[PDB]
Design an enzyme around this catalytic site. Structure first.
Site, short mmCIF file in Angstrom:
data_model
loop_
_atom_site.label_atom_id
_atom_site.label_comp_id
_atom_site.label_asym_id
_atom_site.label_seq_id
_atom_site.Cartn_x
_atom_site.Cartn_y
_atom_site.Cartn_z
CG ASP A 13 -1.96 -1.11 1.12
OD1 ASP A 13 -2.54 -1.34 0.04
OD2 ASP A 13 -2.17 -1.78 2.16
CE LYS A 65 -10.96 -4.03 1.72
NZ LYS A 65 -9.62 -4.05 1.09
CD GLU A 71 -26.54 -4.51 -14.84
OE1 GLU A 71 -26.40 -4.27 -13.61
OE2 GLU A 71 -27.62 -4.94 -15.29
#
Ligand SMILES: O=c1cc(O)n([C@@H]2O[C@H](COP(=O)(O)O)[C@@H](O)[C@H]2O)c(=O)[nH]1
Ligand SMILES: O=c1cc(O)n([C@@H]2O[C@H](COP(=O)(O)O)[C@@H](O)[C@H]2O)c(=O)[nH]1
Lengths: 218, 217
Positions: A13, A65, A71
């Site tokens: 990160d 996440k 869609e």
């Protein structure tokens, strides 16, 4: 299931290429599986996945996440797998259609979905915790084989392992910086995720080696 | 936030040429574009600055932020550095995760939109039952901008009741997902429109048509 070296996944990160590459290279003898999330991707582009594969040949889990309508979820998954991610992490709380959309793309493209059940931070207790057992059961019903659950709540992690069964693959963040214990977490998880405890260390390689030493019997 | 024609374009095309062309075709009708991960993950975060250079539109980054507080802070920083005026954040992960986003937005002069109930069928499983409480959490945290579903006007109306007439509310689900623009604007300040515009035979005529239908609003 994926064969994660030393049961240890790096959460990379850091938010610039040079630092991210340096630290990942420094720990490559200990770790062959790297979780890349939006902090790094939004700073350096999806081509960071390509560079990691080129430089390290590590497996890449895209921690995105995914939490949209079906869609849009499909589009996110297609873009992510196109870039070379081995797997993607998806939220369960938006429901079964949203998860199925991701599973369908992963099946078509020959990649994997990880289902995030309960999260590790304090705020997870407000809404996610009360839905987590049902989200996990939903995953099992949908055929999900890979899961994410919290190191910070051993009792909850144990229950999630029960729900998904011993054959499912379970990875777990929250040990180290967030206060979870690596060894205790590995009673239930196949692998632990470690971010800051490695990438903020003066010597990330020594930090990784130390975590591994602490769980050597496992 | 003053949204031209109460209409926000959801630009979910996944190549730069098409995204820029279509946005250009409808530029006379909108001044606010919602850019999400389909476009950003296909073309890069630099696309946001490019939209600002070409169109001088307001940009809402629809990133459905849903991580722990520490990671949320990083996501918001990266997003605002790229020039987004606002970011959409999930409420389901709880108050600390929302507050992390509010903090960065305050630091950089931007807005947070709190997503409370979603528009798709799966939202009924877990989100819907938490949605009123998520909205009250927004009120408690001082959130002023919200997202709720065009596909369930009774739920949209309840969200409006909770947040008050002063709060700003935008709503996806009209058009492709079956919502009605006019009914949605009884409760929302602006509607979001994606496929009904960008997949239409003629996007400009499609935008014009939506606006004609809500002309009295
Ligand atoms: O419940 C979860 C789910 C996550 O993916 N994460 C992620 O796992 C990593 C934890 O990193 P750290 O070891 O620095 O706390 C971060 O990338 C975070 O976004 C988490 O902390 N909690
Ligand atoms: O509840 C929600 C929240 C969203 O942001 N969205 C987003 O709003 C847009 C809806 O586009 P469309 O008009 O093509 O259905 C998409 O970008 C979708 O990701 C949604 O549809 N439902």
């Amino acid at each position: 299931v994926m064969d994660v070296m030393n049961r240890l996944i790096l959460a990379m990160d850091l938010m610039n290429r040079d630092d991210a590459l340096r630290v990942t290279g420094e720990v490559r003898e200990y770790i062959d599986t790297v979780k890349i999330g939006y902090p790094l991707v939004l700073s350096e582009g999806m081509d960071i996945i390509a560079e990691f594969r080129k430089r390290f040949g590590c497996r890449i889990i895209a921690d995105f996440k995914v939490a949209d309508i079906p869609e849009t979820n499909e589009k996110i998954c297609r873009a992510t797998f196109k870039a070379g991610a081995d797997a993607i992490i998806v939220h369960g709380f938006p429901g079964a259609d949203s998860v199925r959309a991701c599973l369908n793309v992963a099946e078509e493209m020959g990649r994997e979905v990880f289902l995030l059940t309960e999260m590790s931070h304090p705020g997870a207790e407000m809404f996610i915790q009360g839905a987590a057992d049902e989200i996990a059961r939903m995953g099992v019903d949908l055929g999900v084989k890979n899961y994410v659950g919290p190191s910070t709540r051993p009792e909850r992690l144990s229950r999630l392992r029960e729900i998904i069964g011993q054959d499912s693959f379970l990875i777990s963040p929250g040990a180290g910086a967030q206060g979870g214990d690596p060894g205790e977490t590995l009673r239930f998880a196949d692998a632990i995720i470690a971010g800051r405890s490695i990438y903020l260390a003066d010597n990330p390689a020594a930090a990784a080696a130390g975590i591994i030493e602490s769980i050597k019997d496992l």
